[PDB]
Amino acid sequence: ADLEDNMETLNDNLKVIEKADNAAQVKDALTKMRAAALDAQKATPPKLEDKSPDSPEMWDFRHGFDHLVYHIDDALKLANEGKVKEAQAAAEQLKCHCNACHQKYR
Ligand code: HEC
Ligand SMILES: [Fe+3]
Known part of the structure; x- marks a missing residue:
């Protein structure tokens, strides 16, 4: 999918x-x-x-997604342990990383 569609996801x-x-x-x-x-x-x-x-900018952009995936994986650990509230809170830790990339590259 294109970038805009993945962001909607x-x-x-x-x-x-x-x-x-x-x-x-x-x-x-x-x-x-x-x-x-x-x-x-x-x-x-x-x-x-x-x-x-x-360019270093493109590597930084790409690496921002690696870190998002890292956070998703940590939240998945909690979710797979049945820890709904903790997993929800861990997913909220994504938000600053959404914002930081947007500040640079949106
Ligand atoms: C870079 C490492 C990004 C991270 C991490 C996240 N987003 Fe993003 N997003 C990024 C760019 C460069 C853009 C602009 C793309 C364009 O074509 O203009 C966006 C845009 C969005 C949008 C708006 C989509 C639109 O059609 O305008 C949304 C709703 C959005 N991004 C959401 C989002 C969320 C929730 C993220 C963290 C879970 C997130 N983004 C991370 C780059 C990056
Ligand atoms: Fe982080």
Whole structure:
């Protein structure tokens, strides 16, 4: 999918997690977020269109998604342990990282 669609997937599923009734629901949402993060990582954002694909900016952009995936994986651990509230709180730790990338590259 294109970058905009993957961002909608991230945004929608964070809301799903916030509204979830059990940890399996959180797990399913996080799983979709993981996949959308890795698909987004393949994209070139508009603001870097005129930069080298090997530029430090593009590596930073890509690495931002690695870190999002790292957080998703830690929250998945909690979700798979049935810890719905902890897993929800861990998913909220994503938000600053959404914001930081947006500040740089949106
Ligand atoms: C870079 C490492 C990013 C991270 C991490 C996250 N987002 Fe993002 N997002 C990024 C860019 C470069 C853009 C602009 C793309 C463009 O074509 O203009 C966006 C945009 C969004 C949007 C808006 C989509 C739209 O059609 O305008 C949303 C709703 C969004 N991003 C959500 C989102 C969330 C919830 C994230 C953390 C879970 C997140 N993004 C991380 C780059 C990056
Ligand atoms: Fe972090």
